[PDB]
Write a protein that binds this DNA or RNA. Structure first.
Ligand SMILES: [Mg+2]
Ligand SMILES: [Zn+2]
Lengths: 49, 97, 49, 186, 50, 48, 79
RNA sequence: CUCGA
DNA sequence: CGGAACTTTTAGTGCTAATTATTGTCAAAACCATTGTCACGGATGCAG
DNA sequence: CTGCATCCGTGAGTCGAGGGTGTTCAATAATTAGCACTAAAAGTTCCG
């Protein structure tokens, strides 16, 4: 898993897996396009990175 | 972007790594130490040598081999800078376009 | 009907793909290429048999 | 000039006194640490040893000279950097251009074919036709469950049904999906 | 694969299922198996063939 | 056949449907070169 | 039968618009369900289009007025 | 490092 | 296909114990390869 | 102020095959990776 604010991140560049956040709280299609409570990552595909 | 300089787990002890990552880590470490030295009221020559190290890291990251001595990470071989990733017979203008 | 059955029929190597292969390479030329290419006559077109 | 008057002056408050020590000792420290750490990362750990020597000069009791103190600080910072590098992944182990054309490449190569995407769209069309041609209550339950992520209590309150018949409906919908989608995956 | 990625995006992530990642014969070669060598780390149980 | 992300899939869909018709699109390795040049201090932009 | 293309070059002496008009005719034959004028011998649309160039009924002038006539008749029948 | 062109 | 008993889990609370990065330094403290390629332009110092 | 000569940056073909490595003191202050305990929600057979 990448670091919180290092060279490899999630809130700066994007999510690692397709339609799955880093925390694992939001994984369904209903939460597609919203951020979390602590990480703050817009969940999307891996092509954003 | 991290998709252009990937760092991935390779099966077993081996890891697959890009060259630029170490230079980026050195630049980030020198910038953090330069931000921490100016607050604690350091003498002038310590932050002067820190600025010299940061300038050496910056112009080694931009084009390695144009300074007074090309720095190396391992294998007695120079690391591949962003200018070295364009030039040569392995850059984008000769291999992938 | 689907492409999965056609893929399985191609992979199984039946005797019903061969007349289709003779039908699609009737007048379909291919480009041949030499790995050293000095002048323009190293890349020509030919009809396969 | 000796070093006792200089360390007494910088303990007294002279900020321009440690420079005369560092311009006499920095080449010796940069030559000492370079035997333990690699030659590319010498000035960061040498200057970090200099910072940790400047920030702990009041604890110098004066039983010895400054050179053995700076020597022990330099070797300890070199071994601490070696430990921190042992915790870090290697920086130049395997090149990335020699990684795609190699066995067991996870993220260098991707299993994405134009025939695979067309087969994925065909399986999507097949499972969308498999969702249809069903009774309305099972289709309504499976579209309220697996297309929205709702819980069992909302489906039990909306459809006017208990929990167990919703479990039976989603089990029947799942086997009605899996009797068709599983022969297409082989 | 995308045919598994679509199923995982619709109804997946249970974690019980296992993918088929096995060693297979390459396309073109047709050989006869004459020797099987099995090396095992200490502390790991072994099957009957080993 | 080599570079387009959304061009080879549409060409594969059009070939099996009986339509020899391609789309130009845009290559992706040129975007990699654009991101590599843009990572330096040199700005490069595509106009109207 | 297609082994030479030299007479089609002698018809339209540019050797670059021949590929354009043949691709236009083969696209009108492949996409749209049109009738080939020359009788076929179970050949592809490339051979049929090249033989239509060879017989002199198809060039860069017939296709434009044919598309204009098709547009005029579809605007008349659009109502 | 090496092999054929 | 409609129901309750049966059974298996992916999420929320904690809690102790290996991974994290820190403090010390106070007899003194002799140090990487290179080195067996060729051929252009042109910005540089002397050095009159 | 018109030239001398001394270095410093550029480069030196293409297409396939096999095989792939890094130079360590002690003792801790916080710190987070397993892991027990519920959670009935969610999943899986079974009787009309
Ligand atoms: Mg030969
Ligand atoms: Zn999250």
């Amino acid at each position: 898993k990448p670091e919180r604010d290092g060279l490899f991140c999630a809130r700066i560049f994007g999510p690692v897996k397709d339609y799955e956040c880093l925390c694992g709280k939001y994984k369904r299609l209903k939460h597609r396009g919203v951020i979390c409570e602590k990480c703050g990552v817009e969940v999307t595909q891996t092509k954003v990175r | 972007p991290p998709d252009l300089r990937p760092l991935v787990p390779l099966d077993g002890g081996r890891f697959a790594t890009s060259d630029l990552n170490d230079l980026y880590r050195r630049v980030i470490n020198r910038n953090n130490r330069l931000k921490r030295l100016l607050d604690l009221a350091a003498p002038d020559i310590i932050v002067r040598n820190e600025k010299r190290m940061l300038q050496e890291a910056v112009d080694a990251l931009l084009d390695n081999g144009r300074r007074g001595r090309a720095i190396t990470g391992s294998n007695k071989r120079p690391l591949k800078s962003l200018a070295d990733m364009i030039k040569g017979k392995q850059g984008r203008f000769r291999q992938n376009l | 009907t689907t492409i999965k059955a056609a893929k399985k029929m191609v992979e199984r190597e039946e005797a019903v793909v061969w007349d289709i292969l003779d039908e699609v390479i009737r007048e379909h030329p291919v480009l041949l290429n030499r790995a050293p290419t000095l002048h323009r006559l190293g890349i020509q077109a030919f009809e396969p048999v | 000039l000796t070093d006792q008057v200089l360390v007494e002056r910088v303990q007294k408050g002279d900020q321009k006194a440690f420079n005369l020590l560092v311009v006499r000792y920095q080449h010796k420290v940069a030559s000492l640490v370079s035997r333990y750490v690699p030659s590319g990362d010498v000035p960061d750990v040498v200057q970090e040893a200099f910072i940790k020597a400047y920030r702990a000069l009041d604890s110098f009791r004066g039983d010895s000279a400054f050179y053995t103190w700076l020597y022990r600080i330099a070797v300890n910072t070199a071994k601490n950097y070696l430990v921190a590098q042992g915790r870090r992944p290697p920086s130049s182990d395997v090149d990335a251009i020699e990684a795609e054309n190699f066995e067991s490449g996870g993220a260098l190569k991707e299993i994405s074919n134009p025939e695979n995407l067309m087969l994925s769209e065909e399986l999507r069309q097949i499972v969308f036709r498999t969702i249809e041609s069903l009774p309305e209550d099972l289709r309504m339950a499976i579209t309220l469950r697996e297309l929205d992520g709702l819980s069992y209590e909302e489906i039990a309150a909306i459809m006017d049904c208990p929990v167990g018949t919703v479990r039976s409906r989603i089990f029947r919908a799942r086997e009605a999906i899996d009797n068709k989608v599983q022969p297409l995956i082989r | 694969t995308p045919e598994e990625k679509l199923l995982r995006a619709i109804f997946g992530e249970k974690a019980s299922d296992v993918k088929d990642s096995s060693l297979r014969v390459p396309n073109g070669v047709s050989g006869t198996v004459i020797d099987v060598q099995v090396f095992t780390r200490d502390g790991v149980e072994k099957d009957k063939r080993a | 056949k080599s570079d387009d992300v959304n061009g080879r899939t549409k060409m594969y869909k059009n070939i099996v449907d009986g339509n020899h018709q391609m789309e130009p699109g845009m290559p992706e390795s040129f975007n990699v070169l654009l991101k590599e040049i843009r990572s330096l201090g040199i700005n490069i932009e595509l106009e109207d | 039968a297609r082994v030479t293309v030299q007479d089609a070059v002698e018809k339209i002496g540019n050797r670059f618009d021949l590929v354009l008009v043949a691709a236009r005719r083969a696209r009108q034959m492949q996409v749209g369900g049109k009738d080939p004028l020359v009788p076929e011998e179970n050949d592809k649309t490339t051979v049929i289009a090249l033989r239509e160039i060879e017989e002199g009924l198809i060039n860069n002038q017939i296709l434009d007025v044919r598309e204009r006539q098709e547009q005029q008749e579809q605007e008349a029948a659009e109502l």
